Amino acid sequence: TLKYICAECSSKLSLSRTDAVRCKDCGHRILLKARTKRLVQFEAR
Amino acid sequence: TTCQFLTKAVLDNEREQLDSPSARIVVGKLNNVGTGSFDVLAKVPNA
Amino acid sequence: RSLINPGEAVGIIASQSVGEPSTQMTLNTFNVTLGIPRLRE
Amino acid sequence: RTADFRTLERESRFINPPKDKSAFPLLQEAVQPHIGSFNALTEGPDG
Amino acid sequence: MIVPVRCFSCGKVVGDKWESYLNLLQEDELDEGTALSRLGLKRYCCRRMILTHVDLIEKFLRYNPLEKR
Amino acid sequence: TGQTPIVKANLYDDYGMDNFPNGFNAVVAVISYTGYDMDDAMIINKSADERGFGYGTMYKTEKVDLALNRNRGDPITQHFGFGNDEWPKEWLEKLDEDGLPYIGTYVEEGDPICAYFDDTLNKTKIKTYHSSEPAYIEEVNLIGDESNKFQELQTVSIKYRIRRTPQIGDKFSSRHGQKGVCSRKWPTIDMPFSETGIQPDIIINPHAFPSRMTIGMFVESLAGKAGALHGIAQDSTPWIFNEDDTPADYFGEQLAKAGYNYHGNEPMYSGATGEELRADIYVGVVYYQRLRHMVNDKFQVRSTGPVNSLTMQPVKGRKRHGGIRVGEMERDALIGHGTSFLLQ
Amino acid sequence: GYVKGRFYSGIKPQEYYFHCMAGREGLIDTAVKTSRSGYLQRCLTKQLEGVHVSYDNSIRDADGTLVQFMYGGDAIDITKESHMTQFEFCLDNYYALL
Amino acid sequence: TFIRGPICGTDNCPSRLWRIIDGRRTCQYGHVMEGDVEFNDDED
Amino acid sequence: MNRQPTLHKASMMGHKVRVLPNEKTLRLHYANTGAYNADFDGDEMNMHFPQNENARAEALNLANTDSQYLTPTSGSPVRGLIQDHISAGVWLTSKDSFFTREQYQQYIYGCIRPEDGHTTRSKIVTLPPTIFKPYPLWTGKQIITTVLLNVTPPDMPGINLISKNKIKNEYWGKGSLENEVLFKDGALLCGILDKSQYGASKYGIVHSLHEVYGPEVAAKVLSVLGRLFTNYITATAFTCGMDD
Amino acid sequence: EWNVEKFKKDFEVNISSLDAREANFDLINIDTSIANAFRRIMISEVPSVAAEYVYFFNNTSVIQDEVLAHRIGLVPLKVDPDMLTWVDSNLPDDEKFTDENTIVLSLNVKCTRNPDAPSTDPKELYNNAHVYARDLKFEPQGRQSTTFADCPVVPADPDILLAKLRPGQEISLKAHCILGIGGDHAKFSPVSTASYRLLPQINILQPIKGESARRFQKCFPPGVIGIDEGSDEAYVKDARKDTVSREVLRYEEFADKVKLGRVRNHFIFNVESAGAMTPEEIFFKSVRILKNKAEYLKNCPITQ
Amino acid sequence: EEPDREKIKLLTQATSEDGTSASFQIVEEDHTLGNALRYVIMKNPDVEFCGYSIPHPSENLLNIRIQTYGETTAVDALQKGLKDLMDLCDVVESKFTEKIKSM
Amino acid sequence: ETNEIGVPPVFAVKLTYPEPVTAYNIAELRQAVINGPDKWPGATQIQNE
Amino acid sequence: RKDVPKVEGLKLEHFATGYDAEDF
Ligand SMILES: [Zn+2]
Ligand SMILES: [Zn+2]
Ligand SMILES: [Zn+2]
């Protein structure tokens, strides 16, 4: 399920559009996106 | 002092002959030093 | 055979034998105006 | 010996941070004239 | 960051002997001249690596935003 | 993976620079062997750097501001995410549904970095990663606003992870002033191999010492192996050794009792021929510092491209196909060669 | 300032403070060396700019005006006059230089 | 990647553009648009 | 090619392009960097690939590197080997250099290749060794005898040169004569090779090949010498310890 | 003329100490360009299995992408070669990796908050905090199960830390073994270090009986010199025991009485191993790569 | 059926007409078999010249050059050396198999 | 060689020389168009009459 | 001036390749 992470309290918010940019547990206007499961490859040396 | 001379050179009516390398480059002419001081001419065998 | 080959840029080399090694002389005295401010006069 | 790397004191400091006193006190003394000059705007004799 | 896996010169595997190395120091109170030696490190290219290693991964793991507080 | 110096002071720990490591330990054979290491240049090992050897990275963040254009009474016009009346594919392979990219997705130049669909032109006009290096996205931060509590975001910050291995040209330095670029990633099989198998990691030039007088490196290399074998970490505070107490006599009782040669030398062999070398090779462990500025943002190439209007002449700019300038004293050296078709 | 100490055993703290004084006069020199000698090389090459050896070996400025009548009198190429007076050497190698 | 903009010559069709070498723009088939000017400016 | 401070005009020369795979930077020879005055601290040198045939002939005949051997300032040379090979060359020209048979062609063939086309005789020719009865050994002065035999034209005869050094005579023992570098008949019969021979030094052997054999032979010798000691440094190297 | 069947009468091998990780063996009377060529193969041209390709699914932890992608590749995976074949990577992924070239590995590690009571240890405070490299699981792809019933894929050094995790973080990736050689990347090195050294020879010149014999031990490693009395004044027991120290050439009393120098035809090959293969068989992967590096010249048309 | 005609590449512009002075350019080589073969060629008493060279170490190049005295072309002295580079590995294996099996 | 420079393949696929066609260069300029700007001994663009 | 202290109790720390610690 598509979500995020809160900066201060680590609450995995899930934002829809036309929402306030705050977090739901702490009114903290800074919020960092997390990762989903996606497939990426790499080399090695 | 570029336009200081350009004042006087138009006051001079200077028919500049473009023979200095700081003038043959301005018009892009072949420079007259080394491989450009002398012309090279082809002698065709037939009249 | 070791003459000058005419059409030689002896104007450039008269400067680049003067302006080139004058990048090596602004140091301290070993009375006389010395080095580059001598040569500027 | 001569001197030492502290390979158990660093691991005990990395894992367990100092709850009590800032280790390496000279480093806070280096930056201290900046802080100390800014503490003296609002604090000290006469305010 | 963590212990390197191979030595940067020879080619012997190094990373399995770092947390197995502090368990000859925090416990047996050995000197590094025996502690590195009892593991199996006997070339100084691969013996200035378990000795010297900073291991700053621990100061990173205190900064986790995937946890409450 | 940085290490700490074996050879250091004791006004090191009292500032505690183990909380900020800076540099690493290199097995250094002072030898002229390659011929690729002159004018201060030096020779990394291959299989050291393939095992990571100063494996550096870099970071940079970028403001994504729609409110920089937005006026005060300007309504909230354009919005991150896609829209309708469109379907350009493969943006879904770089970006997520909010028009902000997956973290850890390999971007380049030409690739979408965020999708902002306006409503005054009815089309997603994405912007693009404005550099030329293979980056990633480290973390994205969805930044709120101040004067309100409730409106949609018009400011994103996005963090990039440019990886930077030590390629050829990437400058080194020890702690003494012995800087010199990484000239050639020599394969480790053809580097000199010592008595035991101890192959050097950076070959440094002996014809870089006698005009430099950096003899604190001449002793740290024999002190470094003295700390590495015995398991101490010798003090190198200035003025501990008097003239009666030569450090090469101090660090020489250690290496005599160790088993290596008293003078710091080690008999290497030859990695290209197989025979032994004539001399005994000065081998140790020194502390090197991989510098900031590298050659991986210096070179460029231009064949053709953007003329100007006033001049019909090419354009400046390393991010813009920069044109090489043939200048004033470049004009007056082609004349001095006598050539006038390398000037025409 | 007289330092008795050698850089093999190392120098004392007084004389290390003096050897650091001669460094920063060798480094205020470089920061004043670079800006001098550039308005002289370009300063000559706007008069010695089309001066060349014509085919009659005279030194004519390209506007026809003449300065010298040979290249410095003897008119010898400076990149050629190396073994021009090495008279002992030319004798030693007559059968290969002829 | 192509824009809403002009039509040009080279007699392909009524065509569209996009820049490839940042100012000598071409058509679909890499034909050189004869004489662009490419306004820019350098910063400091 | 172009250094950005071009004071002498020999900072602006021309080069045959060899395109090297597996690389991302320019590659320069040490003969060049005594002329451009650009040490390897990573300097931005420009590069200019000319576009017609009136210019490609000029870059091969007027402003090439080999014609810019002497400075046009006072006639001193600006080409030459610089740091590695100079201190390396006083070991091969030293008297204790006793190569065996298999090495002797290998040091020769490592610096001389008819396949790439360095020679003139279209076949590498060897000399007799300097020891016959116990065990046949060659000599390093006889290697310099061979690499003057094989990149110089056969129509002209050998070289003859008297030259000094910077090594004073007493460093080799009881007053021996290794200061007087004496070339006779194209052979290194006495003397060790130094900066005064093959650096940017005047009236040396590389400057006595510039004048006898013309410009494009001495400037081909340094490409052989620059391959000669490099294959010699790699087989036997030169350190600098603490005990020095 | 030099017969090669005289070479057999002047080529001996003294295997000293043969273990399943190192072997210390001798090569009597062979050349420094033939014995180099054996050593020239055993670092590089011997085939050894590792991983170039690290397919991340999920990783949010502190050790980033390309770094843990790097340190998986440095793990010596105990995979015998000649049970894989060579990749042919001139064609894309659809048939580039088969069930016959690639061995496929997966990592699934999740760290949680473990409640425990007391400075507190990280192994008891969290469940699966330290990503050990014994967590690499062989996925049997294709038909890699009817013949891996006695050779399952285990990593050769299992206790390698790969990452340290905190609660919330996980690592989900997919790894692919590739069969490689140590010219391309270092990680396909089949060895710790396969170097040799050469047998020194210590020649006494003047007899050093008595006090000059007893102080003569401390210049050398101990089990080398044997002194008894005036009779049995000194000899050399085994110079193979003696590394080249040259301590005796610091002393002025002994700097003219002795000669140090190698025996030029006794190669002490001491080949260790990283863990993938035994040293006494990767040397057979250099006596038969040389023999099959000549046949690629010999049975090959001399072009033009 | 496939010949790989790019390994033993014989340059011709430095080659004698009689074949007693041949010129190679071997790719997929370096100092590995460059000096292992140069030792074995120089044991053939007919060979007058044999060095191996590398023009530039970056790519795979090994210019070697056999020259002989008489009655044998340089390619016919190559293929004695590569016959006597194989028979060495016959000796080394059955004197190293005979010692592993002997403890 | 001392009269030379070493050039990377990054430079070697950008800088072009307008080589006219004849009967002696046609053995090479045909292989120049086959390669294109992918393999190094090649060509970037051509020019009709 | 008290000397730089000669650290006590140091041993032989390199041996023959295949002869570890039989030397006493
Ligand atoms: Zn919150
Ligand atoms: Zn190691
Ligand atoms: Zn058309």
Side-chain angles (χ1 to χ4, degrees), chain J residues 36-62:
Chain J
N36 189 2
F38 284 160
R39 182 257 167 195
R40 192 58 56 100
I41 295 171
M42 283 184 286
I43 294 173
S44 182
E45 283 286 326
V46 180
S48 179
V49 189
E52 192 81 25
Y53 296 95
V54 174
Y55 289 95
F56 279 109
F57 291 101
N58 199 355
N59 191 8
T60 325
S61 68
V62 182

Side-chain angles (χ1 to χ4, degrees), chain K residues 54-74:
Chain K
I54 289 171
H56 201 283
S58 297
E59 58 267 15
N60 286 319
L61 294 175
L62 187 72
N63 304 334
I64 78 106
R65 184 182 176 92
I66 305 168
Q67 295 172 349
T68 58
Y69 291 107
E71 75 182 2
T72 300
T73 61

Side-chain angles (χ1 to χ4, degrees), chain F residues 1 4 18 52 65 76 114 128 130 142 153 158-159 179 186 194 200-201 216 243 278 305 344:
Chain F
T1 54
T4 194
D18 290 328
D65 195 3
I76 179 165
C114 71
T128 305
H130 196 276
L142 287 81
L153 54 87
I158 175 162
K159 185 182 289 291
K179 69 181 286 186
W186 197 269
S194 176
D201 299 340
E243 191 171 359
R278 176 181 55 82
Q344 204 70 37

Side-chain angles (χ1 to χ4, degrees), chain E residues 2-60:
Chain E
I2 73 169
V3 57
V5 182
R6 293 178 178 269
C7 173
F8 290 165
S9 299
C10 71
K12 187 163 70 177
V13 185
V14 172
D16 61 346
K17 296 177 177 69
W18 166 244
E19 291 179 351
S20 298
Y21 167 68
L22 299 183
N23 287 323
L24 288 177
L25 292 175
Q26 193 72 43
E27 296 178 354
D28 288 329
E29 290 181 353
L30 292 172
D31 49 358
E32 291 85 359
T34 309
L36 300 171
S37 298
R38 191 174 291 172
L39 297 173
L41 307 181
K42 65 180 182 180
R43 292 189 295 275
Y44 69 98
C45 66
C46 59
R47 200 169 182 269
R48 58 107 174 84
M49 187 176 295
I50 293 295
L51 180 147
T52 323
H53 177 66
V54 177
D55 199 358
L56 204 147
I57 192 63
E58 306 291 326
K59 202 191 255 79
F60 277 108

Side-chain angles (χ1 to χ4, degrees), chain F residues 153-221:
Chain F
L153 54 87
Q154 289 189 356
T155 301
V156 183
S157 74
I158 175 162
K159 185 182 289 291
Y160 301 103
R161 185 175 66 244
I162 297 102
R163 60 177 294 169
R164 288 174 182 272
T165 61
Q167 289 293 322
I168 281 168
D170 295 334
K171 289 186 180 180
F172 282 167
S173 175
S174 67
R175 288 179 291 178
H176 304 283
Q178 288 290 321
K179 69 181 286 186
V181 310
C182 182
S183 172
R184 174 174 174 84
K185 301 183 100 293
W186 197 269
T188 200
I189 198 162
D190 300 331
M191 294 283 281
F193 62 99
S194 176
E195 293 288 326
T196 316
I198 306 162
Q199 300 174 2
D201 299 340
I202 301 172
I203 284 178
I204 205 169
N205 191 355
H207 295 92
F209 294 101
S211 69
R212 264 68 175 178
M213 298 179 187
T214 60
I215 310 170
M217 188 171 176
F218 271 108
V219 290
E220 182 177 4
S221 182

Side-chain angles (χ1 to χ4, degrees), chain J residues 1-2 4 7-8 11-15 18 25 30-31 33-34 37-38 40-41 280 283-284 287-288 290-291 293-298 300-304, chain K residues 3-5 7-10 12 26 29 31-33 35-36 39-40 43 45 75 79 82-86 88-93 95-97 99-100 103:
Chain J
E1 193 272 333
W2 181 73
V4 80
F7 179 76
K8 186 172 73 175
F11 178 72
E12 297 292 327
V13 171
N14 293 322
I15 294 175
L18 192 144
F25 56 91
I30 198 173
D31 191 80
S33 62
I34 298 301
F38 284 160
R40 192 58 56 100
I41 295 171
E280 72 274 14
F283 183 73
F284 287 111
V287 78
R288 291 190 299 273
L290 194 71
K291 189 176 185 293
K293 195 182 286 292
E295 290 180 354
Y296 192 76
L297 278 178
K298 178 186 290 293
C300 185
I302 298 97
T303 300
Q304 187 176 2
Chain K
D4 185 71
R5 60 188 69 184
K7 181 67 180 293
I8 181 75
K9 180 180 186 294
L10 186 139
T12 56
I26 311 302
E29 283 286 334
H31 298 286
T32 302
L33 197 141
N35 206 2
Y39 169 73
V40 180
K43 293 292 187 69
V75 177
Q79 292 183 352
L82 296 171
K83 184 179 178 180
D84 289 331
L85 193 146
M86 287 177 62
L88 175 140
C89 292
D90 287 326
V91 175
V92 178
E93 184 175 2
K95 294 299 290 183
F96 187 70
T97 305
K99 294 292 181 68
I100 286 176
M103 293 180 286

